[PDB]
Design a protein around this ligand. Sequence first.
Ligand SMILES: Cc1cn([C@H]2C[C@H](O)[C@@H](COP(=O)(O)OP(=O)(O)OP(=O)(O)O)O2)c(=O)[nH]c1=O
Ligand SMILES: Nc1nc2c(ncn2[C@H]2C[C@H](O)[C@@H](COP(=O)(O)OP(=O)(O)O)O2)c(=O)[nH]1
Ligand SMILES: Nc1nc2c(ncn2[C@H]2C[C@H](O)[C@@H](COP(=O)(O)OP(=O)(O)O)O2)c(=O)[nH]1
Ligand SMILES: [Mg+2]
Ligand SMILES: [Mg+2]
Ligand SMILES: [Mn+2]
Ligand SMILES: [Mn+2]
Ligand SMILES: [Mn+2]
Ligand SMILES: [Mn+2]
Lengths: 683, 683, 289, 289
Amino acid sequence: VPKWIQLNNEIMIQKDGKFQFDKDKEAVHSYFVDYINQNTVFFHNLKEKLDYLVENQYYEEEFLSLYSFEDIKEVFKTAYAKKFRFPSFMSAFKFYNDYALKTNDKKKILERYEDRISIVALFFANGDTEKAKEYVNLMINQEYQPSTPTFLNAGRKRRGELVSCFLLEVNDSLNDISRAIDISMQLSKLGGGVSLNLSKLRAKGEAIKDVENATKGVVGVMKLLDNAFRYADQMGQRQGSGAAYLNIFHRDINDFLDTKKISADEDVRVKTLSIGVVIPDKFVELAREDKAAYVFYPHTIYKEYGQHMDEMDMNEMYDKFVDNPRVKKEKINPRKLLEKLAMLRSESGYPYIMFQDNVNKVHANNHISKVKFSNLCSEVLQASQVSSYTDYDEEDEIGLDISCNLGSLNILNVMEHKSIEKTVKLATDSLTHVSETTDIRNAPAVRRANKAMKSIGLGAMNLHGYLAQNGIAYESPEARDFANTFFMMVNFYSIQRSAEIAKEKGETFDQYEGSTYATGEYFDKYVSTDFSPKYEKIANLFEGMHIPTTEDWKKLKAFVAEHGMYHSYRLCIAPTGSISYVQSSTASVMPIMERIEERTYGNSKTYYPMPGLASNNWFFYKEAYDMDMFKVVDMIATIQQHIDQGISFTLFLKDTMTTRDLNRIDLYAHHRGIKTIYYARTK
Amino acid sequence: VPKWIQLNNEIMIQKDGKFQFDKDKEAVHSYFVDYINQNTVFFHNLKEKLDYLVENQYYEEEFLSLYSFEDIKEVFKTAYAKKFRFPSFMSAFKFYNDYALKTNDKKKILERYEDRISIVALFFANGDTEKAKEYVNLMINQEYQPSTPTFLNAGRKRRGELVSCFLLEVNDSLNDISRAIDISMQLSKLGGGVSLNLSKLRAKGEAIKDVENATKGVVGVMKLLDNAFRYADQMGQRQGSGAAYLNIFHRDINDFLDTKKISADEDVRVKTLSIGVVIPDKFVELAREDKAAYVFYPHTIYKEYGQHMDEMDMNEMYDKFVDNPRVKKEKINPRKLLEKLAMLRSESGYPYIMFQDNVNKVHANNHISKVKFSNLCSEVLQASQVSSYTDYDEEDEIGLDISCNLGSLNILNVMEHKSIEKTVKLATDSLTHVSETTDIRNAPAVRRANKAMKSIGLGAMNLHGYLAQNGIAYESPEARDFANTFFMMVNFYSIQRSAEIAKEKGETFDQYEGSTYATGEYFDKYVSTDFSPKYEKIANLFEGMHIPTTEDWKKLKAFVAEHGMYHSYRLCIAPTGSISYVQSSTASVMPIMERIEERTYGNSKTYYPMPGLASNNWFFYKEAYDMDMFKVVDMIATIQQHIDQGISFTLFLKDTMTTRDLNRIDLYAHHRGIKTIYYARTK
Amino acid sequence: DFTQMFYNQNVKQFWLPEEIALNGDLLTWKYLGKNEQDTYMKVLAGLTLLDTEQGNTGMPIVAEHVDGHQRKAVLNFMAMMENAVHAKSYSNIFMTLAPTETINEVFEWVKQNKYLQKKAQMIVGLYKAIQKDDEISLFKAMVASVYLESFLFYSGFYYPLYFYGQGKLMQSGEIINLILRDEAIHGVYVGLLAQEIYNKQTEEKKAELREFAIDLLNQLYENELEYTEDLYDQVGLSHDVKKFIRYNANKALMNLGFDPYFEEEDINPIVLNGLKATVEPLKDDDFYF
Amino acid sequence: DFTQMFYNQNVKQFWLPEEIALNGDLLTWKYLGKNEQDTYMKVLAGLTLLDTEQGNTGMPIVAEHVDGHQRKAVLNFMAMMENAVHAKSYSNIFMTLAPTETINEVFEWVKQNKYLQKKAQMIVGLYKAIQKDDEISLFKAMVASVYLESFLFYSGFYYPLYFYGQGKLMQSGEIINLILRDEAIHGVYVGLLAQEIYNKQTEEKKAELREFAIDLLNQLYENELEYTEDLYDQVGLSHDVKKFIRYNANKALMNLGFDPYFEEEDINPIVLNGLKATVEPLKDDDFYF
Ligand SMILES: Cc1cn([C@H]2C[C@H](O)[C@@H](COP(=O)(O)OP(=O)(O)OP(=O)(O)O)O2)c(=O)[nH]c1=O
Ligand SMILES: Nc1nc2c(ncn2[C@H]2C[C@H](O)[C@@H](COP(=O)(O)OP(=O)(O)O)O2)c(=O)[nH]1
Ligand SMILES: Nc1nc2c(ncn2[C@H]2C[C@H](O)[C@@H](COP(=O)(O)OP(=O)(O)O)O2)c(=O)[nH]1
Ligand SMILES: [Mg+2]
Ligand SMILES: [Mg+2]
Ligand SMILES: [Mn+2]
Ligand SMILES: [Mn+2]
Ligand SMILES: [Mn+2]
Ligand SMILES: [Mn+2]
């Protein structure tokens, strides 16, 4: 047995009635001095290291050529001057197993944490030495963490894309379905997760050029996409991950949901394709009144009205669709559909739930389009325009397919350094650079929307870690007060940085003038309502850091109206799965699942206590399954009001609660303004 | 039970020790008089019928506008002047159930046999009244039958394509694989069978741009294509049919064959994808000497030589591949692979066997490319060039994908009319017209090859019917003598008509100058060997008909050298499945499977004696299973020497036949020059 | 060629009565007329009684005489479903809808009923006539079994499916649909075992077995028509039930590899809404001619 | 007083081998000596044979002769487990760990092994000797079945348990523990049915039945000793396994209501270490907060 995992297993050996949490420091120390320093390739000087990495196709020469070697040396000194030490064995293990650069035979270790951070910072700065040092300080202090694609691939030659979330709109044609399959395979080949909207596709039993009952529905396209994602699996190390989204008023909604039933046949069930359901407020209203709802055939609506069903307002056109004889509709029970959704989430965790009117009542770019679906992680909520892929000889009408670059603030380290403003602005700059350097040459709509919208996603993590290490319960009103103030400040500084970038570059995102930022309606609750902490305990947490007031928000509103905004979307809170270990942080803004997390890697068993877990804060680290999901919904809705995109909201369910409890949680989330619900995790 | 169904069922009722074959005339008469004349929409004049058909979106106004109504009336007069009578109930039933035009609700009948033939002839002539009358005489005499797509769809507004066989090359790239899936779905949507060459795709466990062992091989593409064909199911009318071809020296050949095993896993098995194996002479030579053979990874060969493995001559390149250390291979047993092929054909009828060197030793367009694979029916053998489908922004390099137009001479009716020359030339003209009028907007390589090659397929049928009705056994040497003479004449007149068309249009097919037609090497066996019948009985069959001599072939060679050749390919003997009933003919050049065909339509069972079956010729209608497959191979090889493309050669096996017997049949077919083997049908 | 595939489909369809809560059926049951409640009870008892014969005799007797370990396992699984799952499910439906005294009386009535008894005893008679090592008698019993699984149950299934398609008695209708789905696969599987025996016979013996199957079908069908009128005339449904019987008779014949006997008919839309030759090596000299 | 609780226990214990992924045992299997792998394969093959006959013959035949639909449902379920679940699980293990030729060889080895043939001959002979309405022949077969469930399996179970207890072959071991958990309740249940018949007899008849049970146990025991030596001598464990089978023989006797026959011994401590969401309808008040 390895010495470091033997030391790491001494955490669970209870001495004097307490877990030996200090063993993890010894565990990581032994891990380093027995595996990492031995397996680390060391060069005489940094120049030899960089030459070796560039020559052997490990790094990219173009980005390293913008700095003189003295500047690169200064950046590396800045990284190593911090003398960063991993606080736990899991942090270092995850870094050196997932993100640290290794030789071509996966034998030795080329990059330390400081080397990777310095390379990512030099990639971000794009020739600026001082900006590179600022990025080094930001990441070595672990105030900001670039997403897994960016952190893993920044500055590497044989790399995937820095963006891993893509959203595709599929038009109701065979040419568009073929192009969707092709683009899905191309993006899965790049390593990204692809989400597809299947609402515009006509339902099963619709006509294909005046021959009736000819269309196979969205389930045939679902099978096509599932096999396309199985094919493009990148060695199978990380198999192709796709998501399909369907509006709840689509006729194929029941067959769409039946693809996830355990008793589904092999000719229907999809395995590699996650599913999400988009629910307008009309469906919730119909289920609330116990009235008879109707699902519609999309092609009939398109023929009758000239627009797709999901491109229309269901809360204003549902009655017109029902009364229209030329529209084909099927009678359903909305409460039965809700119960089926709850049962499917209990048994499989699917579908993802998107509350469409919750997304679009606060959506800033409804002039471009309404948000019709989310991503594979169920937190990207941006306007999309469907493309019209025509025959080979004809020109294609390229729409807007969503993609944003992810990045997380570490709430604990940002709050410790009293650096919300600087961290948010530097992270915004880094995400803007990642957006600018991304060029997808096989997804035309993704490329066009990346150039036009310039959307970024700046998330946060370690919310529960910060609260538990500060003696605040996750369900407590003080926690929601802190989240309100913190994320209002993050929104303020992200909007300020976007406006400053627009002023400097002299350009805004496409169709900015129609957005709510340009009209000033976005800032109504910010110029009217003060978001300063209401509790003295929370107010001391922000001591030494200026909290923008209503006057500051009015000044920012004037600044945005006079200079514009560079990013259509700025903030989205992703799950942040594996980078949470490296940053020694709790995953996303969701509460922790286990206080001490037990994992098996190969034939070795190791335990990961939550960051900062001890006996003085053991009960503040309440597990997500033991807490009220209504209070978690309250917390996420408090955070969501300052986030322009969505939040990956996992529901943590006990075995005792029925499908009625899951439905009640979903309805309370819809009532409280929750935009999306990610997973129904059951213990 | 219908009266005609009862009358047709009285054939099996044996009266005086003989079948009541005359009951089928009563059966068809009753069928007509009781159902067809009742359900046939009648109009006061032909003008009213034509106006109703064009205005109700049944016909195309474009081709009918090319004639004055007087010319169309005279064409219809010519069709009805023959007073054509269906000899059997099954002929009329098949026509009026598969090809006759019906109302949009499929309740009444708009088209009789004469109306369908007149419309097809008017479409063929393209404005020529005398040519239309000639086509009417050719088809109402049932000397020439256009293929099911052409016969069914010609002159129809809501029609599929007139071509149903397509052959696609798939390049070793994700862009090309996605484009192949798209084109396969587009062509299956049109109702055409699609054949895909998978030999260029790199095998399983190959490197993808420095990531070794990352390719799923040809089986992942096979699953993608199977799901693509299942989705593109011809508007839910007829199941989507596709074929995949792999070289026997491809590394994935065993995985390719395992997709057809009855015990195949659901993640390996393909359902709607037929498989064909391409076998060079090198494999047969290795199996003959029992030397252990090697299957090669195609990407290693492409990297080492810059050419695809299937683009190179395995006879000269096999030793170089084996001796090359940079070419990856694994040992196989060629005899074990042959036994596996025979076992698979016994169990499921798959794969098709294409003898690569038998095709290419007589191929007239080896300069353009070698023939690497066949179609879904194993008779189309043409040169193909793989397309390089690049990224979306870049320009694609369009190659040549095979698609030929099918037509069948009725050997019995052509022989009784003494009109081999006239029928062959008119059929060539009609196939040329179908080729010119075909434009496919989503298969650029198919369209380019149709425009450039101008290849057609003129088949033959009713060989066994003609022989049995003339007192000649199918396995007899006299039958092979007749086949030799008849198909030599067919080849002579097809070459003459092609050269005449080239002279008239002043253009040949693309890259004709490199063909064996241009150099005269094609005509060597025709200017050196006499193909007149060697039997007095056979020579009497051709009485009143000039059999081309050696001097005639020399004159044709001079004419082709002077004026060129319009069609790269002219003759291919397709199975001719359903059009054989309408023509009262035995299917293709194959012998009959059963003397009397027992089939069930709806809830009523039907009986179909072979055309011309009686007491006097009962034993000349020997069933195919009772025949010696070696003699059938001899017959097909006699025909194959005059057919530039292949022949759909079905093996008819008894249950007592072993794997060794099937292998012996395959090896004798290879020895005798058979190009392709279609099916292993076991009784 | 088929037993492992059917094994998979059978075991993945496993279910238990407890999974469906039945009490909510009382909210539609109370609104049915006396004739509707009477027909439902009688149909339910008919299905229960026939399915018990299949669990106690039909499946176990076939499992006993069929050779092959894997076939015996699949057949055992099917027998288990009859006795452990289906029988408990029918009992649960009854106990939910009727008081104990009413259940006892309905079963007394259906036990004495001429048309139910005729078909029950005809089927049981063929199971009792199987002789050791006689594949002809086994085939005849398999035909009887397929007729029960794929045909005789359906005059009964009609009514629960009819309610299920209207939004009435949804919990018991869900149970019936699961049962019916099991009987469908049972019928197909036993059908394949019968075809295996049939295909081993001479042409004269085949013609004789076909005559047996058609004659048996005719006897059962004529009794089904009487059974149908006896139960369904009081609720006005007999015409449509008769179409459903013929449609399912055709499925049973197809399971036995035979042609359909009855012309194709459309079914009530409410009910629809409810619903290796020999491997030999190449020994050289086969490559030379 | 007991069938319903056994019914509930049996159905709640339902499982399939596919629920357990076996590729995790690949390395600990690779690491065993050739002697160890040989003994392991043969041990599981002997178990497969026993379950094959218990499923095909033993449980169905006892089900046929035992009165009461609920008792029959339990016995039918147990029969299904024997051949559709237990016997099949061994093939899942074989197909994971061993190449086809080794699998073919071990099944050939069961056919020719004299101890395995003798024990099958004896047990199946008693099953096939049951006479309708003859409770004594039924008792004798139930004793044989208890001896198969609670005694004979254990010379086989020892080895997977011995490895499981050392942290080796733990996925295969998980399957075996599930099988063992089933057989324990099967042995108790059949034991209770046997006691019912025994308790109906005169004292003189009881004395003869005890003689039968003890004579049969001794005869099976002596054969099992030779079988155990044949399998385990090459891995050095024969004496240890013998202690284990004696321990389990006493449990079989106890399941039959008889006193233990062998003296207590210390068993290898390694072997001892080897041992949907509810649907609730939405209310109107659930939509307001
Ligand atoms: C071709 C084809 C289409 N479809 C479905 C998927 C598409 O969403 C939908 C549109 O197909 P299209 O490619 O748009 O077919 P079309 O343009 O000829 O028909 P239309 O005039 O009605 O637009 O039909 C199938 O389900 N199966 C098929 O084989
Ligand atoms: N020597 C050396 N330095 C490395 C390596 N990887 C990262 N570094 C960092 C450590 C220092 O902060 C910085 C400069 O190291 P150096 O080139 O040895 O310079 P110096 O120590 O002579 O000033 O580079 C490495 O492999 N070797
Ligand atoms: N009248 C009529 N003729 C039809 C129809 N379908 C095909 N025909 C053919 C029959 C004749 O050969 C030809 C001309 O028919 P017509 O218009 O009645 O001609 P005429 O005999 O009055 O000059 O058209 C049809 O529906 N009606
Ligand atoms: Mg369209
Ligand atoms: Mg490439
Ligand atoms: Mn049943
Ligand atoms: Mn059944
Ligand atoms: Mn068992
Ligand atoms: Mn047991």
